[PDB]
Amino acid sequence: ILGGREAEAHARPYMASVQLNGAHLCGGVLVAEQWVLSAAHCLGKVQVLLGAHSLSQPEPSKRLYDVLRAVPHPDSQPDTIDHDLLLLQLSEKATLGPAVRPLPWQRVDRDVAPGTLCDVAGWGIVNHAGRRPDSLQHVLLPVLDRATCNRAITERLMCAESNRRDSCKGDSGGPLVCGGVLEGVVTRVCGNRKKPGIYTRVASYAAWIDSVLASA
Numbered sequence: 175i176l177g178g179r180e181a182e183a184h185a186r187p188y189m190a191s192v193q194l195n196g197a198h199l200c201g202g203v204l205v206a207e208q209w210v211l212s213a214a215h216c217l218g219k220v221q222v223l224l225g226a227h228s229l230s231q232p233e234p235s236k237r238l239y240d241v242l243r244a245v246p247h248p249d250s251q252p253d254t255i256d257h258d259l260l261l262l263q264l265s266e267k268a269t270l271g272p273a274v275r276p277l278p279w280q281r282v283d284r285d286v287a288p289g290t291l292c293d294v295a296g297w298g299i300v301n302h303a304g305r306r307p308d309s310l311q312h313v314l315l316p317v318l319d320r321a322t323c324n325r326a327i328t329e330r331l332m333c334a335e336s337n338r339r340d341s342c343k344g345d346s347g348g349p350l351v352c353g354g355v356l357e358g359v360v361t362r363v364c365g366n367r368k369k370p371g372i373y374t375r376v377a378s379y380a381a382w383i384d385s386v387l388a389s390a
């Protein structure tokens with residue numbers, strides 16, 4: 175996250191670090207006891223760290239989970255920006271507590287009103303030099319209407335302003351949360367107002383997400 179602040183420890187209990195060979199790779203969001211939503215482009219040994227604030231310091235809620243299954247969206251492809259969702263099934267149901275709690279997601283397929291303030295969090299890089307934070311960062315960003323944002327922004331995507339405050343490398347797959355509801359997933363440039371952050375609209379994929387979770 176560029177232009178943000180250290181988050182209050184465990185105030186976003188849905189927040190997940192998707193890890194590759196023991197290191198933070200991507201953000202993710204806990205959406206059921208056994209399921210984490212992230213970005214297909216993120217995907218070697220894949221695990222998910224729940225209940226974390228700091229990557230390095232002991233916390234009673236920190237737990238690392240193995241991934242039984244990785245389910246990219248059928249239409250996802252390495253070339254395109256479209257359909258960039260990934261569902262990760264954990265090795266077991268996560269232990270829920272004050273610091274680990276699924277986030278409900280939007281299933282009514284309608285845009286977030288432009289100008290709405292949404293919260294984006296992650297352990298992605300905090301400056302253009304690639305400095306990686308130890309602790310979770312966040313920032314509030316206003317939604318940008320699709321017309322202004324537009325060529326490439328389809329009805330399955332949405333934009334948020336990137337004027338100094340922005341998501342960046344390592345924040346991919348993390349949640350865009352508007353009024354306590356998951357609305358987007360972070361999917362490029364950072365901190366440049368001319369290139370808004372692009373986010374996948376979870377409501378466009380409601381049927382696919384239900385269908386995968388319903389295979390329990």
Ligand SMILES: NCc1cccc(Nc2n[nH]c3ncnc(Nc4cccc(O)c4)c23)c1
Pocket residue numbers: 301302303304336340341342343344345346360361362363364365370371372
């Ligand atoms: N702001 C939208 C957004 C969302 C998610 C990820 C991203 N960026 C990136 N995703 N992957 C990346 N691999 C390498 N570099 C990247 N950006 C970068 C790195 C150093 C300096 C700088 O100004 C920008 C990114 C950007």
